[PDB]
DNA sequence: CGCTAAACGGTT
DNA sequence: AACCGTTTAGCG
């Protein structure tokens, strides 16, 4: 059984940016305080930055 | 299709 | 526990 796939608002996307833009990488805490500010749960937020960096490590390349 | 969210098996 | 590298798949 697939969880759905979840569709992120316009400002959930600008916050995850903005958030990316300042840190590759979260703590426990921050990835927490960044799902609980937007109403995402801890996974998603957790997986949104583990494929943030892949599209990222994608773009060094070139 | 392209982007990208979620799943797989493996690694740190 | 979280991440990695890659795959699989949802949907505009």
Same mark, same amino acid.
């Given at each position: 059984?697939? %969880?759905?796939? !979840?569709?992120?608002?316009?400002? +959930?996307?600008? *916050?995850?940016?903005?958030?990316?833009?300042? *840190? %590759?990488?979260?703590?426990?805490?921050?990835?927490?305080?960044?799902?609980?500010?937007?109403?995402? &749960?801890? !996974? *998603?937020?957790? &997986? @949104?930055? +583990?494929?943030?960096? &892949? %599209? @990222?490590?994608? +773009? &060094?390349?070139?």
């Amino acid at each position: 059984p697939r %969880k759905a796939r !979840t569709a992120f608002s316009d400002h +959930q996307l600008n *916050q995850l940016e903005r958030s990316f833009e300042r *840190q %590759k990488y979260l703590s426990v805490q921050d990835r927490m305080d960044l799902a609980a500010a937007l109403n995402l &749960t801890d !996974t *998603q937020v957790k &997986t @949104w930055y +583990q494929n943030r960096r &892949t %599209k @990222w490590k994608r +773009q &060094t390349a070139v």
